[model samples]
Target: NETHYAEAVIDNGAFGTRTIRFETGRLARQAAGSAVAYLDDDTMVLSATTASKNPKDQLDFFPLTVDVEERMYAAGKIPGSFFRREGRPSEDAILTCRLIDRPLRPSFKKGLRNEIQVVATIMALNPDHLYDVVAINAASASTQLAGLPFSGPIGGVRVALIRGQWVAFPTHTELEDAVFDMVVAGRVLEDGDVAIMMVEAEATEKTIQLVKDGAEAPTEEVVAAGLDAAKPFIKVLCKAQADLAAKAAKPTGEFPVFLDYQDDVLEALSAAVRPELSAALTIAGKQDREAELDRVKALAAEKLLPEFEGREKEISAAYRALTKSLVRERVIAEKKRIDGRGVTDIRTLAAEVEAIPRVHGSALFERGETQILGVTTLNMLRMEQQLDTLSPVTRKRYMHNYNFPPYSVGETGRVGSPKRREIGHGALAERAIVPVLPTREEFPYAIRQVSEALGSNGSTSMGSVCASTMSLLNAGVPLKAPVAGIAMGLISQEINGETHYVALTDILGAEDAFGDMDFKVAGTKEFVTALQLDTKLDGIPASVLAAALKQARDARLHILDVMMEAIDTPDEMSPNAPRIIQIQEDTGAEIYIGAADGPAA
Candidate 1:
């Protein structure tokens, strides 16, 4: 009898995970085994491979490579290359590859003789959650189902704090407001218990509990469902691994222990500097203490690195990780955020509707360092987006696009293709506000909102949500209800393993970077339209997440009041703007154009 393994991915906060089942050589015959993961409407493809050549001598090291590839085509865009096709992976693609590679490396079977490679590509991109985690889980599921000689199945999750609470698998815009951003990896044990694999995060020190709860203990039902779903896929994945091993030859040499020792030295140095870095971050909010804080950071790093002399690569990685951790801890624990806002405080907000007289519908929205000018264009149904991959089925009556220029951030860089980040953000804002929009039956015109960033400090995606809402009201779009968005931040501290948290509202970009959770919530007076949460910490508690949600409601209400003062209801669309009209004619009626092709005769 063949042993089978299963892997599951779960989103404890909002949407949950589903497992893919596969049998070796039964499906997709050209490949060993293929498993498909479905989360909401998004899909991920995972495949396993083994080396074709064997080593001349036994080696203690394991060789593994995981790649995540993304393309414009996945989001329904023609590739803009001279070759007119996909080629190299984007920077985001490479980063996602690293995300998957980092966590799974530790879980490999202890002493597997053959080299193995797992390649998981995102065949579909869902705007709800960062695809990186999805890709990672898909890879895990693929491996599990293949029945390969692997360590076993593992699980991964993304956690965040919103308002004062922890949420799982927050959307992109939600991540923008997160005080913490963390990715947690772990596996389920015998008797159906879960154990952590690793954690990669950035957060302030105050709200560590938010990270812990969100990451470590999700709803038991969600976890169980995910595990059960993964069972079939595990067998397929294991078999694929075995097939690859049969074809590939093994190498005979041992991997260098020097590299492993170098890694250990780097980790030790980082561990030593963490306290000092935390101290520096704690003092970051005070204007007069800026110089002192910088000095402390420099001193800490200086003291830590001497021990790792001549091991520059390991040291660099350690430094990067340490810096990220300190940044997160200080923001969460010290209430000394990058933008200098207190916990539960929002940045100054200013808004103006009908700012441009000629535009059909226009509004300018500003929150602290970020600013967005939004305009709405009404068109006939003919202008609707053609059905494409990103939106294959289109019943959408409203379309929103967000643009970011380097000048907005006071930078100089090439302005060409829309980054995946931009696309993802725009989609999030669009979804957040769509719930409040009127249906086609109520408002027949096809609506399009374009948000141009004039200045950027933080939370620009949320800014777009705000501006789009105001612009729609300004244009007389007849929305079902007014929509508002708020960003929440988390500050966390850990003392003797006990975690404490403080939540902030309307955080700026700097605050988001340093804080543990960037939580974004959008809703009308009665119902939540959209929500997203992300954290640099492991997870957050339910109470903290609930507090954040309540705070978000207050902030959103305040923002709505400001918006109403500018324009309570949409003004008439400008005369110059396109006017859509529905024409009805008798069944037998004939229409003809005038001789000059001016008006119909």
Candidate 2:
């Protein structure tokens, strides 16, 4: 019945103290892990982490699901739906779920088969502070209390570069004038340096650069500065979680789901497939390499399964591990990607404007095998997306939707509502393009951009950003500046007892699958607009990320050039598109209108 509490106060050296308190041993005690993280005093998020007793060993990836419930009741409002209650999660909730999920996933041990779930519910919504950051800390603190096999004690913080100064945990209003804002999650490393695990940011474009002194830092440099500023706050939150865990953590337990493969059998399988698999990886095309690798895997299974007897799973796992090592070795040692591209080389870029007919605007954008069809539709202001969640943004005049059908991946599957990944990608692209969009006063229309993943090998979401820019221009949306995006990757390994990493530009599917980090940067040639990062390793050093941001910027510029070559300026508005005219009220003259049946008539 007792409630235990621990708190951390962050002093960003400029902003006043900001506090986050963690309270546990109260609600959801039945869950394996439960904690309530409160931002200051009013904003509260309750996070419960549970892991299934049964193991789901059949899946390749870790089975982890994160849910963010943005109940309207938290905001003291009733449901907007007919049921008078919350229904399915809104897009904002889904994006928050992703934000919480990315930083926590890499902390868990790989090959974990047990189904782990974290449900973060908004108990109280303070309009000033975003509870998503609080929820991330809540989930992490809860997991720490659970004493799971996690490389955690991680922290999350929102950093904003306001008026050329870094502000940690900037209030909702403070963000209005922020030239750079991002949510950063990381852990304090053993050496006392903060290793960032995830970052999602939206930067104001150069077109909006105030003061016009032309001395403003590039987007990447600003991001690097923000990362440096966030370190202290990140360290504080990490310490807070550790303090809470020290006070109330349950006894640690190892899950029985860890795979137990025979060492000799794994060695035999790796030895059998090393050369052949390495050769197969050299194929230039994704499909060709996949087909060849699949054949090699099938042949290896046939040879090894007969002897191992019911050890097919172990053999397959060994094959994957070996392949990952081979790819990493080539990239790190030889500076060679599987497709023979240099470490920093981007794939071939191609694009077409107005590829689809009868649509208001359309563009086909491709980067090697990844392709996206960006379609823009202009409508009346009333067509904006209605928001009913706890967020202050009630309606969105500019909406972006991303769809990834099975055919894009050369497979077949069910198609219904947008998947969580789709929503997240769409949000990323939407953020990327928002900075360059003209004001509502000038445009006077709601804009919707839908990017279809016609083909996806790597970084289709980024390609969608490139496509959307052209699509908007093709539809005569009068964007202030063109935008482009690039996905950077990392191949890291210990060389001479120090971590050596190479940042790869325009990563491929296998690169992302096996690489340590996927850093997606989107922006105009001069400034960055949006950035997203997810890492497979425990965390990445800020210096490495700073370097990666520069690399991504260079690649972004290259992509933008190819996009501009296709269609650089806005075309005439489609005749079928909706149009509206502004009518000024003539106060000088009395104007009246009446039906024929009215009394005046």
Top-TM-score candidate index? 2
How far is each candidate from the true structure, as Cα RMSD in Å? Answer: 11.2, 4.6
Task: Return the TM-score for each candidate structure.
Answer: 0.61, 0.92
C-alpha lDDT (0 to 100) for residue 72 of candidate 2: 84
Candidate 1 segments exceeding 4 Å error:
1-20, 24-137, 143-338, 390-392, 510-515, 535-539, 582-601
Q: On a 0 to 1 TM-score scale, where does candidate 2 land against the true structure?
A: 0.92
What is the lDDT for 278 in model 2? 82
Candidate 1 lDDT tens digits, 74-120: 56578656777777665446546665665566565544545657776
- What is the Å distance of residue 230 in model 2 from its true position? 0.9
For candidate 2, which ten residues in a row score worst on lDDT? 589-598
Q: How far is 107's C-alpha from truth in model 1 (Å)?
A: 11
Alpha carbon lDDT at 100, candidate 1? 63
Error at 108, model 2, angstroms: 1.3
Per-residue lDDT tens digits for candidate 2, residues 69-165, read: 8878789999979999898998878888988888888788866788999999998988878777888899898888776778888899998787777
